[PDB]
Design a protein around this motif. Structure first.
Motif, PDB file in Angstrom:
ATOM      1  N   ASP A  41       0.913  -1.280   0.018  1.00  0.00           N
ATOM      2  CA  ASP A  41       0.053  -0.073  -0.228  1.00  0.00           C
ATOM      3  C   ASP A  41       0.958   1.274   0.029  1.00  0.00           C
ATOM      4  O   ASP A  41       0.476   2.388   0.540  1.00  0.00           O
ATOM      5  N   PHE A  42       2.150   1.193  -0.632  1.00  0.00           N
ATOM      6  CA  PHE A  42       2.756   2.441  -1.216  1.00  0.00           C
ATOM      7  C   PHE A  42       2.826   2.256  -2.681  1.00  0.00           C
ATOM      8  O   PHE A  42       2.797   1.207  -3.122  1.00  0.00           O
ATOM      9  N   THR A  43       3.077   3.492  -3.341  1.00  0.00           N
ATOM     10  CA  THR A  43       3.047   3.059  -4.636  1.00  0.00           C
ATOM     11  C   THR A  43       4.662   4.158  -5.059  1.00  0.00           C
ATOM     12  O   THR A  43       4.938   4.949  -4.321  1.00  0.00           O
ATOM     13  N   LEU A  44       5.214   3.628  -6.172  1.00  0.00           N
ATOM     14  CA  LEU A  44       6.427   4.194  -6.493  1.00  0.00           C
ATOM     15  C   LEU A  44       6.192   5.104  -7.819  1.00  0.00           C
ATOM     16  O   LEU A  44       5.741   4.463  -8.771  1.00  0.00           O
ATOM     17  N   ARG A  45       6.850   6.221  -7.883  1.00  0.00           N
ATOM     18  CA  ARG A  45       6.822   6.930  -9.203  1.00  0.00           C
ATOM     19  C   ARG A  45       8.025   7.664  -9.126  1.00  0.00           C
ATOM     20  O   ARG A  45       8.714   7.960  -8.157  1.00  0.00           O
ATOM     21  N   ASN A  46       8.505   8.166 -10.235  1.00  0.00           N
ATOM     22  CA  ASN A  46       9.608   9.541 -10.432  1.00  0.00           C
ATOM     23  C   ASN A  46       9.058  10.630  -9.867  1.00  0.00           C
ATOM     24  O   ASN A  46       8.041  10.963  -9.915  1.00  0.00           O
ATOM     25  N   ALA A  47      10.093  11.338  -9.278  1.00  0.00           N
ATOM     26  CA  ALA A  47      10.084  12.549  -8.594  1.00  0.00           C
ATOM     27  C   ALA A  47       9.685  13.661  -9.358  1.00  0.00           C
ATOM     28  O   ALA A  47      10.145  13.734 -10.709  1.00  0.00           O
ATOM     29  N   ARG A  48       8.825  14.737  -8.979  1.00  0.00           N
ATOM     30  CA  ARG A  48       8.342  16.078  -9.819  1.00  0.00           C
ATOM     31  C   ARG A  48       8.764  16.969  -8.923  1.00  0.00           C
ATOM     32  O   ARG A  48       8.867  16.984  -7.654  1.00  0.00           O
ATOM     33  N   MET A  49       8.786  18.209  -9.719  1.00  0.00           N
ATOM     34  CA  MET A  49       8.929  19.646  -9.046  1.00  0.00           C
ATOM     35  C   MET A  49       8.144  19.576  -7.843  1.00  0.00           C
ATOM     36  O   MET A  49       8.586  20.176  -6.641  1.00  0.00           O
ATOM     37  N   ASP A  50       6.724  19.641  -7.970  1.00  0.00           N
ATOM     38  CA  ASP A  50       5.544  19.619  -6.764  1.00  0.00           C
ATOM     39  C   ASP A  50       6.089  18.702  -5.674  1.00  0.00           C
ATOM     40  O   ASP A  50       5.461  18.696  -4.733  1.00  0.00           O
ATOM     41  N   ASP A  51       6.638  17.673  -5.743  1.00  0.00           N
ATOM     42  CA  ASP A  51       7.167  16.631  -4.527  1.00  0.00           C
ATOM     43  C   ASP A  51       8.132  17.466  -3.774  1.00  0.00           C
ATOM     44  O   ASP A  51       8.314  16.889  -2.676  1.00  0.00           O
ATOM     45  N   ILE A  52       8.799  18.555  -4.097  1.00  0.00           N
ATOM     46  CA  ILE A  52      10.180  19.011  -3.484  1.00  0.00           C
ATOM     47  C   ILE A  52      10.261  19.312  -1.984  1.00  0.00           C
ATOM     48  O   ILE A  52      10.924  19.125  -1.172  1.00  0.00           O
ATOM     49  N   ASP A  53       9.136  20.159  -1.974  1.00  0.00           N
ATOM     50  CA  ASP A  53       9.110  20.782  -0.374  1.00  0.00           C
ATOM     51  C   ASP A  53       8.363  19.571   0.503  1.00  0.00           C
ATOM     52  O   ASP A  53       9.008  19.656   1.605  1.00  0.00           O
ATOM     53  N   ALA A  77      12.553   1.388   1.178  1.00  0.00           N
ATOM     54  CA  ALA A  77      13.896   1.950   0.862  1.00  0.00           C
ATOM     55  C   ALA A  77      14.500   0.861  -0.363  1.00  0.00           C
ATOM     56  O   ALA A  77      15.083   1.510  -1.173  1.00  0.00           O
ATOM     57  N   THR A  78      14.436  -0.504   0.051  1.00  0.00           N
ATOM     58  CA  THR A  78      14.731  -1.482  -0.821  1.00  0.00           C
ATOM     59  C   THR A  78      14.090  -1.225  -2.370  1.00  0.00           C
ATOM     60  O   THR A  78      14.921  -1.239  -3.408  1.00  0.00           O
ATOM     61  N   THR A  79      12.914  -0.854  -2.518  1.00  0.00           N
ATOM     62  CA  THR A  79      12.289  -0.674  -3.606  1.00  0.00           C
ATOM     63  C   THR A  79      12.735   0.684  -4.289  1.00  0.00           C
ATOM     64  O   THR A  79      13.143   0.598  -5.548  1.00  0.00           O
ATOM     65  N   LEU A  80      12.959   1.767  -3.476  1.00  0.00           N
ATOM     66  CA  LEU A  80      13.517   2.924  -4.062  1.00  0.00           C
ATOM     67  C   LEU A  80      14.921   2.710  -4.581  1.00  0.00           C
ATOM     68  O   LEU A  80      15.143   3.102  -5.769  1.00  0.00           O
ATOM     69  N   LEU A  81      15.591   1.833  -3.897  1.00  0.00           N
ATOM     70  CA  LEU A  81      17.160   1.898  -4.456  1.00  0.00           C
ATOM     71  C   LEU A  81      17.290   1.114  -5.531  1.00  0.00           C
ATOM     72  O   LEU A  81      18.058   1.488  -6.692  1.00  0.00           O
ATOM     73  N   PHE A 121      13.483   8.708  -7.479  1.00  0.00           N
ATOM     74  CA  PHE A 121      12.129   8.398  -7.157  1.00  0.00           C
ATOM     75  C   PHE A 121      11.660   8.857  -5.696  1.00  0.00           C
ATOM     76  O   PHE A 121      12.192   8.964  -4.802  1.00  0.00           O
ATOM     77  N   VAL A 122      10.126   8.823  -5.546  1.00  0.00           N
ATOM     78  CA  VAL A 122       9.701   8.967  -4.545  1.00  0.00           C
ATOM     79  C   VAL A 122       8.745   7.837  -4.154  1.00  0.00           C
ATOM     80  O   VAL A 122       8.334   7.082  -5.255  1.00  0.00           O
ATOM     81  N   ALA A 123       8.081   7.720  -2.844  1.00  0.00           N
ATOM     82  CA  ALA A 123       7.365   6.626  -2.559  1.00  0.00           C
ATOM     83  C   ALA A 123       6.033   7.373  -1.979  1.00  0.00           C
ATOM     84  O   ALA A 123       6.142   8.181  -1.356  1.00  0.00           O
ATOM     85  N   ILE A 124       4.959   6.810  -2.442  1.00  0.00           N
ATOM     86  CA  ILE A 124       3.761   7.756  -2.262  1.00  0.00           C
ATOM     87  C   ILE A 124       2.746   6.850  -1.522  1.00  0.00           C
ATOM     88  O   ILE A 124       2.400   5.788  -1.815  1.00  0.00           O
ATOM     89  N   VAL A 125       2.129   7.237  -0.527  1.00  0.00           N
ATOM     90  CA  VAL A 125       1.021   6.953   0.208  1.00  0.00           C
ATOM     91  C   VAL A 125      -0.145   7.849   0.357  1.00  0.00           C
ATOM     92  O   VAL A 125       0.009   8.985   0.935  1.00  0.00           O
ATOM     93  N   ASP A 126      -1.139   7.452  -0.457  1.00  0.00           N
ATOM     94  CA  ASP A 126      -2.502   8.175  -0.263  1.00  0.00           C
ATOM     95  C   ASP A 126      -2.028   9.577  -0.706  1.00  0.00           C
ATOM     96  O   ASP A 126      -2.750  10.243   0.284  1.00  0.00           O
ATOM     97  N   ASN A 127      -1.525   9.817  -1.783  1.00  0.00           N
ATOM     98  CA  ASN A 127      -1.092  11.360  -2.044  1.00  0.00           C
ATOM     99  C   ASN A 127      -0.203  12.069  -1.353  1.00  0.00           C
ATOM    100  O   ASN A 127       0.111  13.246  -1.547  1.00  0.00           O
TER     101      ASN A 127
END
Ligand SMILES: CC(=O)SCCNC(=O)CCNC(=O)[C@H](O)C(C)(C)COP(=O)(O)OP(=O)(O)OC[C@H]1O[C@@H](n2cnc3c(N)ncnc32)[C@H](O)[C@@H]1OP(=O)(O)O
Ligand SMILES: [Ca+2]
Length: 157
Positions: A1-13, A94-98, A44-50
């Motif tokens: 119940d986490f999802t992985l996607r590439n990071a975007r500018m809006d993710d940064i703060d 962390a494993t999935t991210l790396l 990459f970032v890991a997302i949970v419910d937005n």
């Protein structure tokens, strides 16, 4: 119940806040931005419910090998920073991210090895890295701002 996607500018703060909560090494805003623009495909970032609950920030460079003693340059990836919020630890994030980042470093950026530095007393991260076949290469004395040593760790891609 986490999802992985590439990071975007809006993710940064959100990324910056995670970094400030979990790590002593707190890079300024432009630092994150430059790495997202330069090495985005491996960032990459890991997302949970937005909400972002974890990140990995990569670098790609030319440098000399940590794996073999050659006089010539090789293409290397580095894990500049990685963190998962405490609440969501031990779930494989962390494993999935790396793995996601390493795959991109290899396929998108043609790196042939990857490295990082980690505090000699950061036993959870060391354990993580070693499970991903990272090996201790060197002890970097007084590497960190508070004087603590680092392991330089590395592995082939
Ligand atoms: C910047 C650098 O490059 S180094 C700095 C690394 N980041 C930090 O120190 C920030 C604070 N800590 C964290 O954010 C996290 O604890 C991290 C990044 C080290 C690991 O995040 P997690 O998502 O919990 O790791 P993950 O779930 O993928 O665990 C995979 C393996 O790593 C090992 N491991 C991870 N955390 C621990 C821990 N606290 N204790 C013992 N072993 C651990 C385990 O072998 C684990 O396997 P298992 O849980 O199946 O038994
Ligand atoms: Ca560390």
């Amino acid at each position: 119940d986490f999802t992985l996607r590439n990071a975007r500018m809006d993710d940064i703060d959100q990324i910056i806040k995670i970094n400030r909560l979990t790590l002593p090494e707190n890079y300024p805003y432009y630092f994150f931005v430059e790495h997202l623009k330069e090495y985005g495909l491996a960032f990459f970032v890991a997302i949970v419910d937005n909400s972002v609950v974890g990140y990995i920030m990569p670098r790609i460079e030319w440098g000399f090998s940590n794996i073999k003693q050659l006089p010539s340059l090789v293409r290397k990836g580095a894990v500049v920073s990685i963190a998962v919020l405490e609440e969501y630890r031990r779930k494989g994030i962390a494993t999935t991210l790396l793995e996601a980042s390493m795959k991109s470093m290899k396929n998108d950026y043609n790196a042939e090895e990857i490295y990082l530095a980690v505090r000699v007393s950061n036993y959870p991260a060391i354990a993580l890295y070693e499970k991903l076949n990272f090996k201790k290469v060197k002890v970097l004395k007084g590497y960190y701002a508070d004087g603590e040593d680092a392991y330089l760790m590395a592995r082939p891609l």
